[PDB]
Chain A
Amino acid sequence: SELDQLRQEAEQLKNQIRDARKACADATLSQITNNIDPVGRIQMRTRRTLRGHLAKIYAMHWGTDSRLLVSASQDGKLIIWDSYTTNKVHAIPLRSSWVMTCAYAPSGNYVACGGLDNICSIYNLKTREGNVRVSRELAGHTGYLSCCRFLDDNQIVTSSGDTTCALWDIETGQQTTTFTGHTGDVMSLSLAPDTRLFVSGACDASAKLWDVREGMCRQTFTGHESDINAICFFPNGNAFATGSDDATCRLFDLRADQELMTYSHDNIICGITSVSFSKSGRLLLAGYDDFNCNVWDALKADRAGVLAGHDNRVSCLGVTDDGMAVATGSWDSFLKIWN
Chain B
Amino acid sequence: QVMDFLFEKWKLYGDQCHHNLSLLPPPTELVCNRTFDKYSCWPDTPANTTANISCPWYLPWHHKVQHRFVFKRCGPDGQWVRGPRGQPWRDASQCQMDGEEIEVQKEVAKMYSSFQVMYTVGYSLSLGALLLALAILGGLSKLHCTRNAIHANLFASFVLKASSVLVIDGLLRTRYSQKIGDDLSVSTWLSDGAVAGCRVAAVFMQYGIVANYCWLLVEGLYLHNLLGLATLPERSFFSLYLGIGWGAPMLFVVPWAVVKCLFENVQCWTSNDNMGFWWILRFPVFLAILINFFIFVRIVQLLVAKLRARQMHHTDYKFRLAKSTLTLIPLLGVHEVVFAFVTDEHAQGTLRSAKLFFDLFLSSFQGLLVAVLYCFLNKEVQSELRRRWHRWRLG
Contact = CB atoms under 8 A, between A and B. Distances in A.
The answer to A–B direct touch (Cβ < 8 A) is yes
Interface of A: 306, 308, 311
A103 B141 CA distance: 30
A306 B141 CA distance: 19
A311 B388 CA distance: 11
B141 A308 contact: no
B308 interface: no
Nearest to B390: A308
The 3 A-B pairs of least Cβ separation, nearest first, read A308-B391, A311-B141, A306-B394
A135 B141 CA distance: 40
A308 B391 CA distance: 8
Interface residues of B, number: 3
Nearest to A291: B387
Nearest to A309: B391
Interface of B: 141, 391, 394
A311 B141 CA distance: 9
B32 to A, nearest CB: 93
B156 to A, nearest CB: 25
Contacts, number: 3
3 contacts: A306-B394, A308-B391, A311-B141
B140 to A, nearest CB: 11
Contacts of A311: 141
A306 B391 CA distance: 10
Do most interface residues of chain A lie in helix, strand or loop, or is the interface mixed? loop
Contacts of A306: 394
A306 B394 CA distance: 10
Nearest to A306: B394
A308 B384 CA distance: 13
Nearest to B384: A311
A306 B393 CA distance: 13
Nearest to B395: A43
A93 B352 CA distance: 66
Nearest to B391: A308
A114 to B, nearest CB: 29
A311 B140 CA distance: 12
A311 B380 CA distance: 12
Nearest to A311: B141
A308 B395 CA distance: 13
Contacts of B141: 311
A308 B394 CA distance: 12
B104 to A, nearest CB: 63
Nearest to B141: A311
A311 B144 CA distance: 14
A171 to B, nearest CB: 44
A107 B391 CA distance: 40
A276 to B, nearest CB: 23
A189 to B, nearest CB: 34
A311 B394 CA distance: 18
A308 B392 CA distance: 11
A123 to B, nearest CB: 29
A25 B113 CA distance: 88
B384 to A, nearest CB: 8
Contacts of B394: 306
A308 B141 CA distance: 13
Contacts of B391: 308
A119 B336 CA distance: 63
A105 to B, nearest CB: 34
B144 to A, nearest CB: 8
A52 B391 CA distance: 26
Nearest to A292: B391
Contacts of A308: 391
A311 B142 CA distance: 11
B269 to A, nearest CB: 48
A75 to B, nearest CB: 14
A306 B390 CA distance: 13
Nearest to A51: B144
A301 B225 CA distance: 54
Nearest to A332: B141
A303 to B, nearest CB: 11
Nearest to B394: A306
A308 B387 CA distance: 11
A311 B391 CA distance: 12
B381 to A, nearest CB: 13
A291 to B, nearest CB: 9
A111 B212 CA distance: 53
B148 to A, nearest CB: 15
B267 to A, nearest CB: 55
B30 to A, nearest CB: 101
A305 to B, nearest CB: 10
B387 to A, nearest CB: 8
